[PDB]
Amino acid sequence: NGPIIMTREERMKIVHEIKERILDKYGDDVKAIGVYGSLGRQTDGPYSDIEMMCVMSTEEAEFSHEWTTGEWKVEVNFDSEEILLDYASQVESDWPLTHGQFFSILPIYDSGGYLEKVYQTAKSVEAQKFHDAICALIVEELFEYAGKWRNIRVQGPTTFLPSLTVQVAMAGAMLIGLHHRICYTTSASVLTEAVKQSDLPSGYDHLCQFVMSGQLSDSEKLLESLENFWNGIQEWTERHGYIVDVSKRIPF
Amino acid sequence: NGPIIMTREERMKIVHEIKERILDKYGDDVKAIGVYGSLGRQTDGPYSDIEMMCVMSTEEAEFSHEWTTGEWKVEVNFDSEEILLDYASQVESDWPLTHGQFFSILPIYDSGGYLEKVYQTAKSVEAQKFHDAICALIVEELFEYAGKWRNIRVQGPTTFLPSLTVQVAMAGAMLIGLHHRICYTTSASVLTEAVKQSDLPSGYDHLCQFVMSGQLSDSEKLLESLENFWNGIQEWTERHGYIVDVSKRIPF
Ligand SMILES: NC[C@@H]1O[C@H](O[C@H]2[C@@H](O)[C@H](O[C@@H]3[C@@H](O)[C@H](N)C[C@H](N)[C@H]3O[C@H]3O[C@H](CN)[C@@H](OP(=O)(O)OC[C@H]4O[C@@H](n5cnc6c(N)ncnc65)[C@H](O)[C@@H]4O)[C@H](O)[C@H]3N)O[C@@H]2CO)[C@H](N)[C@@H](O)[C@@H]1O
Ligand SMILES: NC[C@@H]1O[C@H](O[C@H]2[C@@H](O)[C@H](O[C@@H]3[C@@H](O)[C@H](N)C[C@H](N)[C@H]3O[C@H]3O[C@H](CN)[C@@H](OP(=O)(O)OC[C@H]4O[C@@H](n5cnc6c(N)ncnc65)[C@H](O)[C@@H]4O)[C@H](O)[C@H]3N)O[C@@H]2CO)[C@H](N)[C@@H](O)[C@@H]1O
Ligand SMILES: NC[C@@H]1O[C@H](O[C@H]2[C@@H](O)[C@H](O[C@@H]3[C@@H](O)[C@H](N)C[C@H](N)[C@H]3O[C@H]3O[C@H](CN)[C@@H](OP(=O)(O)OC[C@H]4O[C@@H](n5cnc6c(N)ncnc65)[C@H](O)[C@@H]4O)[C@H](O)[C@H]3N)O[C@@H]2CO)[C@H](N)[C@@H](O)[C@@H]1O
Ligand SMILES: [Mg+2]
Ligand SMILES: [Mg+2]
Ligand SMILES: [Mg+2]
Ligand SMILES: [Mg+2]
Numbered sequence: 001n002g003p004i005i006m007t008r009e010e011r012m013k014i015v016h017e018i019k020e021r022i023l024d025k026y027g028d029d030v031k032a033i034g035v036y037g038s039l040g041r042q043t044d045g046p047y048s049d050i051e052m053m054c055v056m057s058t059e060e061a062e063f064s065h066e067w068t069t070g071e072w073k074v075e076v077n078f079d080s081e082e083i084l085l086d087y088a089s090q091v092e093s094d095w096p097l098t099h100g101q102f103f104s105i106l107p108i109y110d111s112g113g114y115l116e117k118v119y120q121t122a123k124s125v126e127a128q129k130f131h132d133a134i135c136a137l138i139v140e141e142l143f144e145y146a147g148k149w150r151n152i153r154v155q156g157p158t159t160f161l162p163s164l165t166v167q168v169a170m171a172g173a174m175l176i177g178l179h180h181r182i183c184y185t186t187s188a189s190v191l192t193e194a195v196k197q198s199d200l201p202s203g204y205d206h207l208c209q210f211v212m213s214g215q216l217s218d219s220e221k222l223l224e225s226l227e228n229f230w231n232g233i234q235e236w237t238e239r240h241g242y243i244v245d246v247s248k249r250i251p252f
Numbered sequence: 253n254g255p256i257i258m259t260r261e262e263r264m265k266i267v268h269e270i271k272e273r274i275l276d277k278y279g280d281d282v283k284a285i286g287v288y289g290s291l292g293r294q295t296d297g298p299y300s301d302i303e304m305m306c307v308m309s310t311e312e313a314e315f316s317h318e319w320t321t322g323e324w325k326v327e328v329n330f331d332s333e334e335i336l337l338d339y340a341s342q343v344e345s346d347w348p349l350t351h352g353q354f355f356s357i358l359p360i361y362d363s364g365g366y367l368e369k370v371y372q373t374a375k376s377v378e379a380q381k382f383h384d385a386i387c388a389l390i391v392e393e394l395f396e397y398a399g400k401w402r403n404i405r406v407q408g409p410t411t412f413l414p415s416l417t418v419q420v421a422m423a424g425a426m427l428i429g430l431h432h433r434i435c436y437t438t439s440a441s442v443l444t445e446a447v448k449q450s451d452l453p454s455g456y457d458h459l460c461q462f463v464m465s466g467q468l469s470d471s472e473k474l475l476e477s478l479e480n481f482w483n484g485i486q487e488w489t490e491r492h493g494y495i496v497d498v499s500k501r502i503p504f
Binding site: 001002003017018021025045046047048049065066067068069070073139140143144146147148150151152154155157159160161162163164166169170187188189191192211212213214215216217218219222230231234244245246248249250251252 | 253254255269270273277297298299300301317318319320321322325391392395396398399400402403404406407409411412413414415416418421422439440441443444463464465466467468469470471474482483486496497498500501502503504
């Protein structure tokens with residue numbers, strides 16, 4: 001029932017069993033095999049799972065195998081070189097959470113240096129893409145949440161406020177991550193690493209204190225804390241040049 | 253600054269300005285235009301935004317316009333009839349959260365009853381698709397969370413436990429929603445509607461109380477509530493036959 005305790009030696013044994021099955025099944029279509037996640041960083045804990053990535057020569061290839069044996073769980077990603085390089089060069093709103101997987105790949109097999117090329121791609125993204133992703137995050141995520149908690153203040157339900165506050169704090173950590181071009185190590189340390197950064201929006205550290213401590217029961221403290229962070233976003237975007245275009249009423 | 257208070261009449265005025273602009277720009281390539289979300293249900297609050305969907309005749313068309321004027325926010329989706337019908341018939345892990353948009357479409361323009369056809373498509377999905385989505389949710393989300401809180405119990409960090417508990421409760425609502433073929437009304441009512449259903453896994457209602465009340469500061473209580481809900485998942489799927497295949501050690 002659930003994940004069992006495993007050692008780093010047992011997980012690496014499973015990884016090489018999977019590599020041999022990938023090489024047996026696809027032969028010389030395999031360009032590279034690598035380990036990412038906590039195992040690829042060699043910081044896996046007793047209950048950690050396994051994540052692997054595979055680069056195929058078959059163009060347009062994109063599939064994944066993810067399973068459990070009842071005791072442990074594995075995920076193996078299969079991508080063509082172009083699909084993986086393209087995704088490594090796209091900056092979404094959750095880029096600080098997702099793209100850290102490309103900065104600590106443990107090489108297992110590589111016919112033509114593909115694992116190194118992916119690393120150089122994710123690390124050489126031009127500045128304009130982060131600027132555009134920040135403006136998209138403010139409109140698509142922050143402005144949306146602001147309307148939701150302002151509605152809760154006047155019509156409820158306050159039973160959603162703790163969940164929304166976690167989402168607002170997580171989106172703020174993405175904003176800080178995009179600003180500093182930082183990818184957080186893992187999901188469990190996103191908030192802890194975000195508040196340690198410079199150039200934080202005003203009120204973000206206070207909002208994070210509620211979420212990290214789990215004190216989300218005082219709705220009136222949370223709503224005032226959210227409104228201060230939203231005001232801190234307006235000063236922050238002007239301070240850093242991130243101008244969201246508001247001039248047009250219908251922009252198409 | 254931020255979303256402004258607006259009435260339902262002012263929001264519908266903006267919608268018809270957008271409809272008139274969509275018809276001028278694409279002409280007879282537009283098959284249908286509809287409003288979904290809270291405005292399409294006529295339950296929009298003072299701070300609610302606007303979501304619209306547009307069915308195009310142009311094949312393989314898929315794009316979206318999402319913007320703000322500084323006072324309000326609009327999102328308009330453009331899809332071909334085949335792409336939209338396909339998406340309405342695929343069941344993902346968050347299907348109970350996303351596909352409610354097809355059950356409360358407000359028709360604004362419809363040349364050939366396309367909006368009703370989309371409704372019939374999303375409403376006639378066969379049972380096996382929900383069965384497979386439930387098995388995938390258990391492995392990809394619930395089993396994943398179980399390893400993270402079991403790691404937190406032995407090595408921390410407990411500052412992630414409140415965020416993780418909110419995510420686990422939301423994933424449990426997806427499980428219940430997939431089982432009963434329920435689309436939750438809105439994101440703010442997911443937990444409120446999930447605990448009112450029948451045939452809940454044991455311990456889910458107790459875990460939900462922490463998230464709905466915001467009392468997520470007692471780390472040791474949360475870990476016991478998570479472990480009880482995880483045990484209730486194994487018994488729930490067994491009583492329900494939802495057997496996740498564990499027979500093979502490498503299933504490809
Ligand atoms: N691979 C190239 C590229 O990937 C794209 O796909 C995306 C994304 O759509 C996809 O999500 C997977 C789902 O499609 C699938 N149904 C279930 C999988 N579990 C998803 O995998 C991704 O999400 C989980 C978490 N939900 C990640 O696992 P884990 O939390 O243990 O984290 C391990 C390491 O991965 C990084 N990380 C952390 N959180 C995330 C999230 N939320 N998303 C992505 N990466 C994350 C972090 O550094 C950590 O150390 C799992 O690793 C993750 N793969 O997955 C990929 C993006 O990874 C497209 N398929 C396509 O463009 C192309 O194939
Ligand atoms: N939405 C369109 C819809 O579907 C079809 O269109 C296809 C097609 O446009 C495209 O499919 C890919 C092809 O172009 C390509 N030539 C081969 C690829 N294999 C196709 O991708 C699809 O193939 C498999 C299906 N067995 C999917 O992978 P899988 O089932 O294992 O995914 C499981 C979950 O894991 C996530 N995932 C998948 N791959 C990765 C990687 N590399 N890293 C991380 N996560 C991954 C995934 O999100 C999933 O939840 C694969 O996902 C799938 N894209 O894209 C669509 C896919 O249907 C029809 N032609 C079209 O008419 C129809 O409207
Ligand atoms: N359109 C057909 C189909 O859609 C697919 O795309 C998905 C998904 O990828 C996409 O997400 C959008 C992002 O790509 C974009 N970067 C930002 C947009 N804001 C996203 O739109 C969706 O997510 C927001 C939530 N941040 C939804 O807003 P709102 O929360 O106010 O909810 C309004 C009503 O919509 C339903 N709902 C509630 N929560 C969700 C979530 N998380 N996802 C989807 N729907 C949700 C609910 O009933 C509520 O009453 C926003 O409405 C939503 N559109 O959006 C679509 C799915 O809608 C593919 N592009 C493709 O297969 C094809 O186009
Ligand atoms: Mg892992
Ligand atoms: Mg994982
Ligand atoms: Mg809305
Ligand atoms: Mg919206």
